[PDB]
Amino acid sequence: QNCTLEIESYGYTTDDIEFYWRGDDNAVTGVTKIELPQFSIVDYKLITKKVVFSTGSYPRLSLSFKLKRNIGYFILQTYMPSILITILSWVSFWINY
Amino acid sequence: SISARNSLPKVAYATAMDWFIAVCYAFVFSALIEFATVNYFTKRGYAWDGKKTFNSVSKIDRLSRIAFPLLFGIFNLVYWATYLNR
Ligand SMILES: CCCCCCCC(=O)OC[C@H](COP(=O)(O)O[C@@H]1[C@H](O)[C@H](O)[C@@H](OP(=O)(O)O)[C@H](OP(=O)(O)O)[C@H]1O)OC(=O)CCCCCCC
Ligand SMILES: *[C@@H]1O[C@H](CO)[C@@H](O[C@@H]2O[C@H](CO)[C@@H](O[C@@H]3O[C@H](CO)[C@@H](O)[C@H](O)[C@@H]3O)[C@H](O)[C@H]2NC(C)=O)[C@H](O)[C@H]1NC(C)=O
């Protein structure tokens, strides 16, 4: 997945305010020590841009992650019972006609 | 196995109860595979009437009457002693 956080200024345009990440890539810390039970944060990326609405152009900092889902829970719950219940279906070939 | 994997978070690893569930799944299948082998090695389509050549009691049945309960008994003495202590 690609989950984003969209930081933006509401009332002040780019003529009234300016946004920047303080410290470049050393501006968002503590990401690597986050532990999720079913996901794993592969990468995070920081974007500085401007968006143009009808009322003007506003600054925007976009913070985003790259969550990758762990597989072994779904192997333990969904895939392997379906595999075993499919192996059970071919027991019937050995029973007499 | 499906209902036991509820009201706990979706962790990637396998708990002790999941190991117990795998061993029990195996013991309930090896039993099914044992019956499949017995039915592969069966012969006539008539049972004993209590009074022709009739079927015999399978040697796989007489071994699994002893080996399957003891191997589950050995597993319980291993599993419950290892985790209750830890
Ligand atoms: C999951 C385990 C799978 C094991 C698969 C093991 C598969 C395997 O090896 O089968 C062969 C044999 C089958 O024996 P079983 O008693 O089931 O079958 C008899 C056997 O075939 C005799 O030879 C037959 O007499 P005959 O000669 O025709 O006159 C007799 O016919 P009838 O006299 O009634 O007409 C048959 O009923 O089993 C063992 O020797 C015990 C193995 C125990 C192995 C360990 C089991 C825990
Ligand atoms: C998750 O999704 C977001 C949004 O789709 C990704 O952000 C995008 O990242 C690329 C790579 O940095 C950006 O392209 C760059 O744009 C700048 C603009 O000046 C340009 O100078 C660079 O040469 C490059 O082309 C892209 O703009 C950006 N998307 C938006 C809407 O800003 C992100 O990479 C994805 N992955 C992660 C791990 O976050």
Side-chain angles (χ1 to χ4, degrees):
Chain A
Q1 294 314 307
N2 180 300
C3 284
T4 59
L5 183 71
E6 295 293 328
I7 300 153
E8 198 178 339
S9 160
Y10 199 86
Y12 298 102
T13 58
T14 52
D15 304 321
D16 280 333
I17 204 171
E18 185 201 329
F19 280 180
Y20 66 97
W21 288 108
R22 203 179 44 163
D24 291 331
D25 203 14
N26 314 120
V28 181
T29 66
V31 170
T32 64
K33 67 185 78 169
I34 304 306
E35 204 275 339
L36 284 81
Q38 69 197 316
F39 278 107
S40 78
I41 300 176
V42 174
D43 201 1
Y44 73 102
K45 199 168 308 172
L46 317 178
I47 301 104
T48 300
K49 48 177 286 202
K50 295 164 194 173
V51 289
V52 174
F53 282 117
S54 168
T55 54
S57 62
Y58 300 94
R60 156 176 297 192
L61 308 183
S62 173
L63 199 157
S64 45
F65 308 111
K66 212 172 201 172
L67 278 78
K68 191 178 176 182
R69 196 183 315 266
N70 295 120
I71 298 89
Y73 164 72
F74 292 91
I75 287 176
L76 216 52
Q77 174 159 106
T78 76
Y79 280 103
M80 195 67 76
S82 70
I83 287 165
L84 292 191
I85 208 74
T86 305
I87 300 296
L88 161 62
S89 70
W90 309 309
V91 187
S92 171
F93 294 151
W94 299 97
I95 296 89
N96 202 9
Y97 64 94
Chain B
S1 179
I2 297 305
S3 80
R5 200 69 171 165
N6 289 121
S7 168
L8 75 163
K10 302 177 164 62
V11 290
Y13 42 82
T15 76
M17 195 174 47
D18 301 312
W19 287 119
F20 196 84
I21 281 177
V23 173
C24 291
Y25 250 128
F27 271 123
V28 107
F29 230 68
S30 299
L32 176 70
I33 285 167
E34 188 269 352
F35 171 63
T37 313
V38 163
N39 194 277
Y40 175 58
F41 277 123
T42 196
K43 281 205 174 182
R44 306 126 182 119
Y46 39 88
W48 197 14
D49 55 349
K51 278 89 177 167
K52 289 195 285 182
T53 50
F54 284 162
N55 265 303
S56 64
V57 185
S58 179
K59 293 178 183 290
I60 319 176
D61 282 332
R62 303 212 301 124
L63 286 200
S64 302
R65 277 168 195 178
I66 308 300
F68 271 56
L70 269 70
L71 267 294
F72 194 46
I74 290 302
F75 167 67
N76 279 120
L77 292 177
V78 165
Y79 174 78
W80 289 101
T82 314
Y83 290 71
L84 280 191
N85 296 0
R86 84 192 295 180

